[PDB]
Structures are given as structure tokens and as C-alpha cells.
Design a protein around this ligand. Sequence first.
Ligand SMILES: OC[C@H]1NC[C@@H](O)[C@@H](O[C@H]2O[C@H](CO)[C@@H](O)[C@H](O)[C@H]2O)[C@@H]1O
Ligand SMILES: [Mg+2]
Length: 362
Amino acid sequence: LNNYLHVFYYSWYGNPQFDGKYIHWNHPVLEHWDPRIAKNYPQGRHNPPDDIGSSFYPELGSYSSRDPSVIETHMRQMRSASIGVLALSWYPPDVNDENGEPTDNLVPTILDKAHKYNLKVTFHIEPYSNRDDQNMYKNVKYIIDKYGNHPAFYRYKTKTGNALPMFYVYDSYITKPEKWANLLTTSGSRSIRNSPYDGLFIALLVEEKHKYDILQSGFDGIYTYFATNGFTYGSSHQNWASLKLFCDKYNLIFIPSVGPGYIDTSIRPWNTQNTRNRINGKYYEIGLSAALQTRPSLISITSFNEWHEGTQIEKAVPKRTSNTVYLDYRPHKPGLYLELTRKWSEKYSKERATYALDRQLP
Ligand SMILES: OC[C@H]1NC[C@@H](O)[C@@H](O[C@H]2O[C@H](CO)[C@@H](O)[C@H](O)[C@H]2O)[C@@H]1O
Ligand SMILES: [Mg+2]
């Protein structure tokens, strides 16, 4: 069970059975800002269970994240894949993504279940409205005060520092470095550094130039998230070597994000250019291979169950409707991407041993 391997996990799915309504599966088709194109594409909310906001279809179907048996299954599948850490998409309580309802109320159950399959839960901080250095302080405090004592709570166990929480911060670069440095530098007006609420803060890098913004901000590490090689400077794995090298110079944790392919045209029909075909695993493997080159401190996986963007490694089946031929992992099985992960996880987990300065040889 590899604890240096992280996977981005979403809890925002709902169905009538458990939530009393469909959530996220019944996703709207997001309109192009230019309506003179929006009108040449589908419109409105997907009407599940047959029609969902996804180019693939889950084994569990139109499932509820509030369904213990789903959480259980999910944990089990991550375990099969030998992932130790799920990076849970998080919004503050009474707050939600624009296409969902709130999901902090669920976290207690997700931890209990992560614990039950001896898995760990770190937090993937979404860009909630008015996110800044101030409410971030209030939320870190809430998160550790609320979930720190839970034996599922993830802490990067520094070989010989303190065991430190990790916070992945999605679209960090939105908040100016001056503002981050209030919270993330030692002498910042609201610094949690050297405090009971200190952690390892991970910033999304997009453009080459975000490097320097990230240093000025006070962040401990960087992650790329994006599954589409070519989309951003970060998500392009040819760049990854330079980001490792930079991260080494400035004592930053370089966490590359590897994805098994990309397709989001169920909800962003204009977004074809970033579609990547899975090539039955070849994409995913070239991604995980390029990540291992760098000899990274952790590796992140985009994603377990981002179904809208088609980055999910979770078990998916073939399905056909009156009008839709859903994609699927055929020729191979529902578990294909869990096995490709288990494979490369055990390879990473092993290779990572030879890295440490203490474990070198004559
Ligand atoms: O986890 C970070 C990032 N991942 C990809 C998306 O899930 C993105 O969320 C936006 O896009 C989804 C559709 O892809 C949409 O449901 C949501 O409301 C958006 O916030 C997310 O921030
Ligand atoms: Mg150290």
C-alpha cells in the first residue's frame, strides 16, 4: 500500500435513492462565452440514469457519494491500485461547487471508511467564492481542529521532522503572491508557519512563470493536476524535468499529476482540442513513466472519479442508448486502470527506496 501516491477523489455525485435528487450526473452542458458557437452544440441538463454528464459509464452507475457501499467499493478499488492517499475535493461547509450541493458534511464518513481499508485522506482545496489568505486560515484551522485526530487524516511523515498535513490548493495563482505570503511565510501577518495549524501547502502551476509567483507566496510544493499533455506548461510532461530541477533548487515538493486520458465533451462540447484517447493504457503508462523519470517526492493521479473530464481510473463498463455509444476500457476490463496503477505504484514504491541519500551505495 503506497503512501507516496495520491489520487484526486470527488464526493459531489448524488441520486434520488440517497440524496433524493440527481447531482453532477445531471450536469449542464456548459455554454461557450461566444453564443454564436454555443447554439451549434447540445444544451441543458443530462437526464440520467441512461444519459449522464460523462463520456464513460460507471460500474456503480449514477451512484450517490453519500452511499457507504460506494465509498467502500471506491476504497477497495484504490487499495487494489495500491494508492495510500485520496486527495478529497473540498469546499467549506454550507458551500458547494456551482453544479453541486455541499460535501463537507460527508467527510466524517469518508474518513471512517478510509480508515477501514487503512487509507489516508488529504484535502484538495477548490476555489470557493472569496477564497483568500484570511478564510484559508479559518478553513485550515476548522479542517485540523475537525479531522486531525481521525486516524485516516493524512500527514506527510517527514523521515525526521514533524508529521505535517498536506493541502493541495486548486487555482492558487488566483490569489496574488503578496496575499499568500501573509499566511505562508514565517513573518506573515497571519502566518500558520511554526503554529499548531502549520502544513504542506501545494500550489497549482499553469504557465512557466507561476514558478516565481509560487516562491513569493510561501508554498511548500507544486502540482500540475491537468491530464492533457499539451494543455498547460505544467501538464506537459516534457517540462516536468525542469519543474523537478527548479523544485530541488528551492526545496519545493514537485508533485506531478498523471492522467489516463481526457474527454469532457459531455459538458464542454467545444473542448475537443484537449481530448486525449486512452490508447488502451499506453497514454497512462507514458504519463506514469515520465513522472518516474523525474524521481518525484510524491505522484498525484487525475483522477479517481472526475467522470465529466474523462480522467477517472474508477471501474467503468460498456453502455449503449437509443442515441449514445458510451466509451469504455474494452478491449480490456473495467479494472484495467486499477491494474496499470497497482503495477506502476509497486514499481514507484520500490524505485523510491533507492532515491534517499542514506540508502545510496558505493
Ligand atoms: O479538482 C480540481 C478541478 N478538477 C476538474 C473539475 O472537476 C473542476 O471542477 C469544475 O469542473 C467540473 C466539471 O469538470 C464542474 O462540475 C465544477 O462545478 C467545476 O468547478 C475542479 O475544480
Ligand atoms: Mg526535509
